[PDB]
Amino acid sequence: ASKGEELFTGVVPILVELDGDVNGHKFSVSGEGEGDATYGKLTLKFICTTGKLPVPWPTLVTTFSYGVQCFSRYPDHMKRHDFFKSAMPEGYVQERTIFFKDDGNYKTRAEVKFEGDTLVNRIELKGIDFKEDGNILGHKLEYNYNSHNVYIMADKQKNGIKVNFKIRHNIEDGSVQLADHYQQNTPIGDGPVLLPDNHYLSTQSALSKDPNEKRDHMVLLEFVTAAGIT
């Protein structure tokens, strides 16, 4: 019904690459998996290629995925509102500032585009102002994830979208660390893109470990479905 969709009818290979620096600590992670937009589902495995990840794995989930929202299932009646797939194959730039409450912040820039037959997400991250005793550099986060809604509005002026949401990360003492996300997506290409009416993406994630894997790693399963328009 609209072009770009067609790239996503089957199961699509995903490549994720991140280079980061948090308070001066540098690290890289690579990830691979597959996305099925028909079901609204992603499976990804991430490996820290530089040793042991210096921040908790859960703090990077939205950066890696929250990272490939072109795999969202859009119900037929709101397929006119799917910015993410409409920007493909050329892709889009995704930028965020993520504010951890009472702590530092991540600033990220990513490019999400087709390189051949695989969808690749290449990311740069800088984090600063983190306390060495805080929930993040202290590694007090539980290894798990909650459900969140991700709110989307068009930004007519940038030919893109603005996205806001707050992540609730469970701390191992029973409290919650809030992570306020501000996001901006703009097409890499020249062509028209679909600028949406306000809606949101219902997102669920589950984190596990491959018990055969000796590297520091995260396995991520995620289900994402668009909603909010009648």
Query: What is the secondary structure of 7-32 as a DSSP string?
Result: GGSS-EEEEEEEEEEETTEEEEEEEE
Task: Give, in order, the Cα–Cα distances in Å from 50 to each of 29, 81, 88, 217.
Answer: 7, 39, 31, 11
Query: What's the CA gap between 118 and 104, in Å, rounded?
Result: 33
In the block, tokens 């798990």 appear at 144
Q: Which CATH class is domain 1-230?
A: mainly beta
Q: What is the resolution of this structure in A?
A: 1.9
Smallest Cα–Cα separation from 62: which of 149, 153, 161, 154? 149
- Cβ distance 138 to 105 under 8 Å? no
Where in the chain are the domains?
1-230
The sign of the torsion formed by the CA atoms of 181, 175, 61, 200 equals negative
Structure determination method: X-ray
User: Helix, strand, or coil here: 48?
Assistant: strand
Q: How many H-runs (helices) and E-runs (strands) does the chain carry?
A: 2, 11
CA angle 197, 202, 205 (to 5 degrees): 145
